[PDB]
Amino acid sequence: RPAPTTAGAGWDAGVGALVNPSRRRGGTLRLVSSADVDSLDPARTYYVWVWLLQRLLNRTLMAYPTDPGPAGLVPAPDLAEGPGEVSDGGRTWTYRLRRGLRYDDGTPITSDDVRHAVQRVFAQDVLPGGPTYLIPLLDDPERPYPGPYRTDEPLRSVLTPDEHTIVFRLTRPFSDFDHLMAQPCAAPVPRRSDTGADYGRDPRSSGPYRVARHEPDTLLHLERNPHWDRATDPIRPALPDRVELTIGLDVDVLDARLIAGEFDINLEGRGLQHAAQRRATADEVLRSHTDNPRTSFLHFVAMQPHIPPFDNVHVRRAVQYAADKILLQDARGGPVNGGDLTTALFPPTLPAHQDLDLYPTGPDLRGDLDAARAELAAAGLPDGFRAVIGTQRGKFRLVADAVVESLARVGIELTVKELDVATYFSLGAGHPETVREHGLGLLVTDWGADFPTEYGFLAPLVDGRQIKRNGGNWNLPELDDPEVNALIDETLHTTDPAARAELWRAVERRVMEHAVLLPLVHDKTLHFRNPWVTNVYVHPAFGLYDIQAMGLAE
Ligand SMILES: NC(=[NH2+])NCCC[C@H](N)C(=O)O
């Protein structure tokens, strides 16, 4: 019976809890996406939803557990027997592999294959597209590693004492290393099957499923991996016999067919679009099949000290005070569906999350214009000034327009520069030269961490060492405060998680003191779940349903 005709578990039932629990194996899970995968090479994917799909295809040393609660944020032993063994003050990480495990072709998984996967990341000329956190942590600047296609000498910082042991000797302490071991670029790839640029056409699988067929822009079918051993996998229930992804639908077409029951779940997970949002949130039966989680993305405005007059802290504080947070949230969808207002940066899933509101916007949250004008006077610009805000067409433009309206009230006169959506991070707001070319003193953007920790969340946004001069830059103000950098370094060797949280609170406070980032909202989304899908929950590390946990009702 289609969803509109029978009530489900209830609004938000899959947020922090598991809906429709079952161990029943069998059936075909019908997934849908508006977009094709970015890559089927585990090293070359960045899409959050493809990382989710990778939980079906490939195992890793550590993986996020199948848990809707806070424990879901802590990597658990997967291919490893236990969590990474830390020595040398957070600089050496040792893992011990489970024995006798096999790929889909029946061949053995060994520590050499995990080293090979990590080595492949270095071949950015052949395998671009995935995360590269591992490179600075493992590369010797005095003796650079050119990747495994250009030399057969192994990476010197990665030891394999035997077939079931791997040791990573890092260039610096790194508290969050288990998280890097949970990313798909660290899933084992045996060198014997590594076809390099072509690997995605026929990747090996260590997970419960393997690729049966991929037809670009059309479909992806997965079948069981006959060599995966259920008894050896503490993460994956592997309930369906088959997973079939339909690719390429218009987003409203997708929502309509999903709600009609023609597909079980939206894999891409961008949420219901406006039309279906209205329909679902208004209907008592449809509400019972909907979850409204935080996505852990932050929507914010960045201000760039390299673009006068934004070099002046008082100019930046004036902007913070004059922000109409209500208007800005409304631009984000927000009378009722505009995410969650925030005056700070960390999502509330992180330990360091704190009350921090250095520039309050008045009793109605619409702006403290007196405070803003006083800041403008401090800047020597009491009547305001002219500037340019960079944005994208669409939702980001409505937000930019809300900034224009907000700031006009204190004589800050903004014009809007739109930049190409596709390349916004590579060549647009994410490229320091572009920001200078168009004189973009303000930039509208959003961000989600590549792993659910304070470092993963905040370092790319504020750490001076993370400024990407050639594009893909996420530190838009190009903040390079040695005190912030030093505090971040301290967190990375601090073993005690509580002391670590306090240091991160100091970092976030210092960042807000600089006033280079204006937080707007933490984003939220509406996911629809058909009632015959079992084990549905929003994975706290992803903000999307954990597809791999799902089954089908009898
Ligand atoms: N694997 C992921 N978490 N992908 C989505 C986030 C990618 C990147 N941090 C961004 O905000 O654009």
UniProtKB/TrEMBL annotation:
A single GO cellular-component term on record: ATP-binding cassette (ABC) transporter complex
Region (Disordered): 188-211
Ranges annotated as biased composition (Basic and acidic residues): 191-204
Any one biological process term the GO annotation gives: clavulanic acid biosynthetic process
InterPro entries: Peptide/Ni-bd, SBP_5, SBP_5_dom
Gene3D superfamilies assigned to the protein according to its UniProt record, in alphabetical order: Dipeptide-binding Protein, Domain 3, Periplasmic binding protein-like II
Entry GO MF terms: peptide transmembrane transporter activity
SUPFAM superfamilies: Periplasmic binding protein-like II
Pfam family, one: SBP_bac_5
Signal peptide residues on this chain, from the entry's feature table: none
Domain Solute-binding protein family residue range list: 75-466
Protein name stated in the entry: ABC-type dipeptide transport system, solute-binding protein
